[PDB]
Amino acid sequence: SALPELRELIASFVSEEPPEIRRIRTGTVPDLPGSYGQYFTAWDFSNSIVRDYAMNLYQLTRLATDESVSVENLLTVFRTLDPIYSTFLGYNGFPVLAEYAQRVGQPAESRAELLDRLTTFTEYVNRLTAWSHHYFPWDLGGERYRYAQRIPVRLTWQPLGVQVDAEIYADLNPQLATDVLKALPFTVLQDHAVVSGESMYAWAPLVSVAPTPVRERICDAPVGRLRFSQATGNKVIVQYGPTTETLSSPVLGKVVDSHADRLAEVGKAVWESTFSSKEPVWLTVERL
Amino acid sequence: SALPELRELIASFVSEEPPEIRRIRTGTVPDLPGSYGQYFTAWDFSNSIVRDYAMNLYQLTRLATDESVSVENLLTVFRTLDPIYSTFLGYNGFPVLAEYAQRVGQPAESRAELLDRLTTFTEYVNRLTAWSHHYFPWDLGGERYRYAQRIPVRLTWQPLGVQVDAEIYADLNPQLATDVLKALPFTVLQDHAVVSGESMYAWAPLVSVAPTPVRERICDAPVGRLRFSQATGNKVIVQYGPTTETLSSPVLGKVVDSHADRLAEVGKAVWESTFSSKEPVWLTVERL
Numbered sequence A, B: 001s002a003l004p005e006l007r008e009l010i011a012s013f014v015s016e017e018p019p020e021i022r023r024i025r026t027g028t029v030p031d032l033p034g035s036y037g038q039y040f041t042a043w044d045f046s047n048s049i050v051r052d053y054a055m056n057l058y059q060l061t062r063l064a065t066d067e068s069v070s071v072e073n074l075l076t077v078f079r080t081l082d083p084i085y086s087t088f089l090g091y092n093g094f095p096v097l098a099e100y101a102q103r104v105g106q107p108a109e110s111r112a113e114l115l116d117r118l119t120t121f122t123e124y125v126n127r128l129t130a131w132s133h134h135y136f137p138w139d140l141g142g143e144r145y146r147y148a149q150r151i152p153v154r155l156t157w158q159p160l161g162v163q164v165d166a167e168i169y170a171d172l173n174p175q176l177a178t179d180v181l182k183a184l185p186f187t188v189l190q191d192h193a194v195v196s197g198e199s200m201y202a203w204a205p206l207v208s209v210a211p212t213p214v215r216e217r218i219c220d221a222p223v224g225r226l227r228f229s230q231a232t233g234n235k236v237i238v239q240y241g242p243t244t245e246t247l248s249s250p251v252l253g254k255v256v257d258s259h260a261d262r263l264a265e266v267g268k269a270v271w272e273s274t275f276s277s278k279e280p281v282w283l284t285v286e287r288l
């Protein structure tokens, strides 16, 4: 692996909160970011920029697989787009992120080396984004801003104790389905969508660059739909109710019909976790 | 002009709030984004994603000036990075933004045409970011998250009624100085920094891709220092007190020493505007 220390940090942070996330959410970042004795605004920037930085990194990873763009042009693109993000994040509570971002932009021997760096770095920043999303106070605007070929797998949420059986559609997005199946089993933090609607997503431990030709409109997905979003952090997404987002999502599978009614209880508890209580909910996906 | 309607919107939004920002900050976006009867989370996503999208667009504009990357590769880079940002923004309150993002990605007959599209589109998104930053509720975490040659110009703030004299350093970053000087006079909204400390910035009506070799550490800048950040929105930055951001910022000029004592009351009043009251403070920059 190109960045072996990040690999150790990736394996560690699947179950442990990164120390930089804890410092940001408690206002203990050195040099004290934030204007006039508060740390919410810096917290707001830390959470959003690391998320959008991860989106940039994944698209740069995709570009590294595009053979029409030379390695020299790839590095030029990275060296232009990266610094404004990574230098701010290093000052705003992510020194190790900034350290490795500038390491990714070092001269590269080949396309494979650069793709290796970008794939590992993206998964690392994806995990920091995963924890930042879980702890960000999404309820802070509450009250004040209110409206008026079928591979069987098992999904378990703890400490809820809810289990559902599901099927991975291995013949729709075959490369994507194989990428998810090879990561099994894994246990990651389960969090709720904060804009979309009644859906949950969990940052899975992989970076898939597979094509996603088979998609469906998010606001048209059935209850129990398993979809996968590479662009927003390589997340396993479980739809449990009506949604709103109009973008289409790659189809991964579906919870079995005899277990789809079990998802309402999970979505409610996971919503309370992400929105208010921050009590962790752990999703385990395993091969049947 | 490649995108003449954006030029008209750019001219209008210098003094008028874009309807997109008005609907986002009042929870009147037609798609009703946000989970469980609130629109703060969608508001939080709208403000930050449009800001970081603008940062991406500027670095893509700079990439359009790099003739080591072919026009074909530039479009490939744009078509890879852009959709995940623009399609979400089109659903989360910026339909016209997503529309012209697809315009920019269309086949281009020349580098000059594509650079024209990116320069115009970047300024348009920069102004959306400007108004979004002004109206975002930065004080929401206020109580719950707290710690424990020389070209003479005049800067006027209204309706505060305070004027200062300054000098633009035309020999340090020369092309940057001419870019700003060619945009004078302009009157734009004056807002406060929300992370770095006691400085204020205003989105100026230009997109400069000039080199900025002469820089100064932000946390080391003097009182009255005029800085210019191309990468964070082509903003004229007035430092009136201590700061904490460790990055280096391009040096544009400085307020005259005899008028530097007036900046303290402007900064405090601009802080109240950005952080709490949202009463507009208008900055006018003109040559002497």
Ligand SMILES: N[C@@H](Cc1c[nH]c2ccccc12)C(=O)O
Binding pocket: A192, A193, A194, A195, A196, A197, A232, A245, A247, B049, B084, B085, B088
């Ligand atoms: N809908 C997701 C966020 C999201 C989906 N697609 C995106 C694309 C870009 C940025 C954010 C998103 C949520 O509610 O959390």
Ligand SMILES: N[C@@H](Cc1c[nH]c2ccccc12)C(=O)O
Binding pocket: A049, A084, A085, A088, B192, B193, B194, B195, B196, B197, B232, B245
């Ligand atoms: N200092 C700015 C924020 C900022 C500075 N540099 C940046 C780079 C990227 C993103 C944000 C920033 C503020 O407090 O408002």
